[PDB]
PDB file of C-alpha atoms and ligand atoms in Angstrom:
ATOM      1  CA  UNK A   1       0.123   0.062  -0.075  1.00 45.60           C
ATOM      2  CA  UNK A   2       2.570   2.561  -1.252  1.00 47.10           C
ATOM      3  CA  UNK A   3       2.011   6.286  -0.888  1.00 45.79           C
ATOM      4  CA  UNK A   4       3.863   9.329  -2.341  1.00 47.89           C
ATOM      5  CA  UNK A   5       4.239  12.872  -1.276  1.00 45.95           C
ATOM      6  CA  UNK A   6       3.330  15.174  -4.006  1.00 44.56           C
ATOM      7  CA  UNK A   7       5.108  18.030  -2.402  1.00 44.17           C
ATOM      8  CA  UNK A   8       8.900  16.785  -2.340  1.00 46.92           C
ATOM      9  CA  UNK A   9       8.640  13.081  -3.767  1.00 46.71           C
ATOM     10  CA  UNK A  10       9.110  10.856  -0.799  1.00 48.00           C
ATOM     11  CA  UNK A  11       7.323   7.629  -0.304  1.00 48.82           C
ATOM     12  CA  UNK A  12       5.289   6.012   2.772  1.00 48.15           C
ATOM     13  CA  UNK A  13       3.481   2.707   3.646  1.00 50.92           C
ATOM     14  CA  UNK A  14       0.356   4.132   5.202  1.00 50.88           C
ATOM     15  CA  UNK A  15      -1.972   7.249   4.209  1.00 52.59           C
ATOM     16  CA  UNK A  16      -1.611   8.345   7.885  1.00 53.78           C
ATOM     17  CA  UNK A  17       2.091   8.196   7.385  1.00 53.78           C
ATOM     18  CA  UNK A  18       2.139  10.134   4.182  1.00 54.37           C
ATOM     19  CA  UNK A  19      -0.045  12.632   5.686  1.00 54.35           C
ATOM     20  CA  UNK A  20       2.045  13.165   9.016  1.00 55.51           C
ATOM     21  CA  UNK A  21       5.026  13.766   6.699  1.00 61.41           C
ATOM     22  CA  UNK A  22       3.464  16.128   4.261  1.00 59.79           C
ATOM     23  CA  UNK A  23       2.209  18.406   6.797  1.00 59.31           C
ATOM     24  CA  UNK A  24       5.865  19.209   7.750  1.00 59.43           C
ATOM     25  CA  UNK A  25       6.186  21.163   4.356  1.00 58.35           C
ATOM     26  CA  UNK A  26       3.086  23.846   5.023  1.00 59.36           C
ATOM     27  CA  UNK A  27       1.814  22.305   8.258  1.00 60.40           C
ATOM     28  CA  UNK A  28      -0.824  24.897   8.037  1.00 58.56           C
ATOM     29  CA  UNK A  29      -2.570  24.223  11.329  1.00 59.22           C
TER      30      UNK A  29
HETATM   31 ZN1   ZN B   1       7.323  15.460   1.357  1.00 59.52          ZN
END
């Protein structure tokens, strides 16, 4: 169940993983 970040281009194994990660780029809230 591979995931990809559409912000840097890093991969993950879970959707929750991907999310936690991506929110370190903008991490709005
Ligand atoms: Zn990223």
